[PDB]
Design a protein around this ligand. Structure first.
Ligand SMILES: N[C@@H]1[C@@H](O)[C@H](O)[C@@H](CO)O[C@H]1O
Length: 372
């Protein structure tokens, strides 16, 4: 199995004790490390900020301590949006320019591969044709990586891609049979399945359906999502399950109702270090628990959730990860991806359970392999 881990670029911009630098990561903890996000300019891959080139050098410099470790560069993301991709895949000319720049760029900075993260190739403003086009880009990109590897004579560069965790998004933007043929891996976004927008309390990455999940919500769970992918042509070995190191905060309209499906008003207040609304890193949830937040286990969905006053949090802990890692033996080889690493108690300061409690669990249960 593979233990992939995301390293956010804006993580080192958090308050000192909440700041995570690329060289602070354990080289033997993951099998694949993915870099926050790269940018695009003139249908050419490029960095987001000059500071980045220094993160690349430090990120790949870990391959000295762990020779089997592989690093990938991710382009895309939610903020990025579909617009730039739609325009880059529009013509074979633009396509060939991106692909070559991705090769030059990746080979120059010592990356072993590229992670495409086109947030939804068929929705959010992307036309239906992009479902077909996205497929073309992959087949084309896979082929050049292949030629480059033959002529230059070096291990081929990996090509992965994220995949929707929402049925209706998968149907309009992903050609799974063809895609599962050209990609090396598919990181499935099995998280954010419920958010304060829904209007009720829900869970971030539930393993199973909730006795309250009705209609399309019945599929809003790891088990159902993975099965849809598998049933539509995706190879189990190539599927990589999403493991979030954070939770989502809601605000109960009645502190009397603190269970799943409880009526909500809005997202929760920003956390001390991760400054957003609606979220809380794993280590930030530990403080919440430590300050008297009533912790309860969701048996039907196999995940935890806690609450304080009118503050509700749906997250994941070591127990939910272990339970999820055992389920992962659905020949769901390949394995899991931690999203994001910097949101795990990397220092042991907040959750007094040593470094990377969540990732350490996945690593042990997936028996991560490394002659080091
Ligand atoms: N590439 C990022 C990932 O960090 C995240 O796993 C995915 C689904 O949320 O969103 C993307 O934009």
């Amino acid at each position: 199995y593979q233990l992939m881990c995301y390293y956010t670029s804006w993580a080192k911009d958090r308050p000192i004790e909440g700041s995570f630098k690329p060289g602070n990561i354990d080289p033997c903890l993951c099998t694949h490390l993915i870099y926050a996000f790269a940018g695009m300019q003139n249908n050419e891959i490029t960095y987001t900020h000059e500071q980045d080139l220094r993160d690349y050098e430090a990120l790949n410099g870990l391959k000295d301590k762990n020779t089997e470790l592989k690093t990938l560069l991710a382009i895309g993301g939610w903020k990025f949006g579909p617009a730039p991709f739609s325009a880059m895949v529009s013509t074979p000319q633009n396509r060939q320019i991106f692909i070559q720049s991705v090769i030059r760029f990746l080979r120059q900075y010592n990356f072993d591969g590229l992670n495409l993260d086109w947030q939804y190739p068929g929705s959010r403003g992307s036309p239906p044709k992009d479902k077909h086009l996205f497929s073309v880009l992959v087949k084309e990109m896979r082929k050049a990586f292949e030629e480059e590897s033959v002529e230059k004579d070096i291990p081929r560069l990996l090509l992965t891609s994220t995949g929707a965790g929402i049925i209706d998004v998968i149907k309009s933007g992903y050609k799974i049979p063809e895609l599962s043929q050209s990609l090396d891996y598919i990181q499935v976004m099995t998280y954010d399945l419920h958010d304060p927008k829904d209007g009720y309390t829900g869970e971030n990455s539930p393993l199973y359906k909730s006795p309250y999940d009705i209609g399309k919500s019945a599929d809003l769970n790891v088990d159902s999502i993975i099965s849809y992918w598998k049933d539509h042509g995706a190879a189990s070995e190539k599927l990589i399950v999403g493991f979030p190191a954070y939770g989502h905060t809601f605000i109960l309209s009645d502190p009397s109702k603190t269970g799943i499906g409880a009526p909500t008003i809005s997202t929760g207040p920003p956390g001390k270090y991760t400054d957003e609304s609606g979220l809380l890193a794993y280590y930030e949830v530990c403080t919440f628990l430590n300050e008297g937040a009533t912790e309860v286990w969701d048996a039907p969905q196999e995940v935890p959730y806690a609450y304080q006053g009118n503050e509700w949090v749906g997250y994941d802990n070591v127990r939910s990860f272990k339970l999820k890692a055992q389920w992962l033996k659905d020949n769901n080889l390949g394995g899991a991806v931690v999203w994001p690493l910097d949101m795990d108690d990397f220092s042991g300061s907040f959750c007094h359970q040593r470094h990377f409690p969540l990732t350490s669990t996945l690593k042990g249960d997936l028996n991560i392999h490394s002659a080091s």
